[PDB]
Amino acid sequence: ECYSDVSVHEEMIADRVRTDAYRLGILRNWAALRGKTVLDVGAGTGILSIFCAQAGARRVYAVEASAIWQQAREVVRFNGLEDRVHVLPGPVETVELPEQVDAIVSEWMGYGLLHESMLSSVLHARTKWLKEGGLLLPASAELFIVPISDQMLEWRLGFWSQVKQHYGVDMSCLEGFATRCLMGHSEIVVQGLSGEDVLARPQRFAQLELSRAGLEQELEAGVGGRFRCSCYGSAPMHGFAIWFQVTFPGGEKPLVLSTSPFHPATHWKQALLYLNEPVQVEQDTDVSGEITLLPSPRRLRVLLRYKVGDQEEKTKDFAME
Amino acid sequence: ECYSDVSVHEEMIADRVRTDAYRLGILRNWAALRGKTVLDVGAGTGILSIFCAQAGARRVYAVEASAIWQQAREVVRFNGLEDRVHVLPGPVETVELPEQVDAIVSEWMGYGLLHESMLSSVLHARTKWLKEGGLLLPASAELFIVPISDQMLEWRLGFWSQVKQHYGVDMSCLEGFATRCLMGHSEIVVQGLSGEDVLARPQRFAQLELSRAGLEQELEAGVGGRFRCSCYGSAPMHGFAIWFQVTFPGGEKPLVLSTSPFHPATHWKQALLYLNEPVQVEQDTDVSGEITLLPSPRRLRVLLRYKVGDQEEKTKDFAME
Ligand SMILES: Nc1ncnc2c1ncn2[C@@H]1O[C@H](CSCC[C@H](N)C(=O)O)[C@@H](O)[C@H]1O
Ligand SMILES: Nc1ncnc2c1ncn2[C@@H]1O[C@H](CSCC[C@H](N)C(=O)O)[C@@H](O)[C@H]1O
Ligand SMILES: CN(C(=O)c1ccc(Br)s1)C(c1ccccc1)c1ccccc1
Ligand SMILES: CN(C(=O)c1ccc(Br)s1)C(c1ccccc1)c1ccccc1
Instruction: List, as one string, the DSSP characters of B125-157.
Output: HHHHHEEEEEEEES-EEEEEEEEE--HHHHHHH
Taking the C-alpha atoms of residue B246 and residue B109, their distance in angstroms, rounded to an integer, is 9
Q: Which residues of chain A have a CB within 8 Å of the CB of B54?
A: 168-169
Q: What number of other Cβ atoms are within 10 A of residue A69's Cβ?
A: 21
Asked whether residue B119 falls in the same domain as residue B154, the answer is no
Taking the C-alpha atoms of residue B132 and residue B139, their distance in angstroms, rounded to an integer, is 14
Asked whether residue A112 falls in the same domain as residue A249, the answer is no
Contact yes or no for B170 and A6 at CB 8 A = no
CATH number for position A29: 3.40.50.150
Instruction: Classify residue B184 as left (phi > 0), alpha (psi -120 to 50) or beta.
Output: alpha
Instruction: Supply the range of the domain harboring residue B259.
Output: 140-321
Asked whether residue B126 falls in the same domain as residue B144, the answer is no
CA distances from B83 to B41, B74, B78 (A): 19, 13, 12
Asked whether residue A161 falls in the same domain as residue A223, the answer is yes
- Domain stop point among A138, A169, A186: A138
> After which residues does chain A have a break in its backbone, defined as C to next N over 2.5 Å?
251, 296
Taking the C-alpha atoms of residue B230 and residue A121, their distance in angstroms, rounded to an integer, is 56
Q: Indicate which technique resolved this structure.
A: X-ray
Taking the C-alpha atoms of residue A287 and residue A272, their distance in angstroms, rounded to an integer, is 16
Asked whether residue A216 falls in the same domain as residue A297, the answer is yes
The set of catalytic residues of B is 107, 116
Q: Does B2 touch chain A (CB under 8 A)?
A: yes
Asked whether residue B115 falls in the same domain as residue B174, the answer is no
CATH number for position B151: 2.70.160.11
Exposed, middle or buried by CB within 10 Å (0-12, 13-18, 19+), for B269?
middle
- Domain stop point among A107, A138, A169: A138
**What percent of chain B is helix, strand and coil (3-state, nearest 5)?**
30, 35, 30
CA trace torsion A179, A185, A191, A195 (10° rounding): 60
Element (H, E) at A126: helix A113-129
Asked whether residue A296 falls in the same domain as residue A148, the answer is yes
Asked whether residue A61 falls in the same domain as residue A154, the answer is no
Asked whether residue A182 falls in the same domain as residue A291, the answer is yes
* Ligand 1, atom 13: closest residue by C-alpha: A42
Tell whether residue B224 is among the known ligand binding residues.
Answer: no
Asked whether residue A147 falls in the same domain as residue A286, the answer is yes
Q: B103 φ, ψ to 5°? A: -150, 150
Q: Which of B91, B239, B219, B164 is nearest to A50 (CA)?
A: B164
The set of catalytic residues of A is 107, 116
Q: Which residues pair with A268 in a beta bridge?
A: none
CA distances from A14 to B155, B166, B167 (A): 12, 10, 11
Q: Spell out where chain B has E strands.
A: 37-41, 59-64, 85-89, 101-106, 130-137, 140-148, 189-191, 203-209, 223-230, 235-248, 255-258, 270-281, 286-295, 300-308, 314-320
Asked whether residue B134 falls in the same domain as residue B146, the answer is no
DSSP secondary structure string, A50-107? Answer: HHHHHTT-SEEEEEE-STTHHHHHHHHHHTT-TTTEEEEES-TTS---SS-EEEEEE-
Q: Which residues of chain A have a CB within 8 Å of the CB of B22?
A: none
Residue A51: closest CA among chain B residues belongs to which residue? B169
Contact yes or no for B23 and A178 at CB 8 A = no
Amino acid at B177: F
**What percent of chain A is helix, strand and coil (3-state, nearest 5)?**
30, 35, 30
* Count of structural domains, chain B: 2
Asked whether residue A114 falls in the same domain as residue A14, the answer is yes
- Domain stop point among A138, A166, A185: A138
Q: Does A12 touch chain B (CB under 8 A)?
A: no
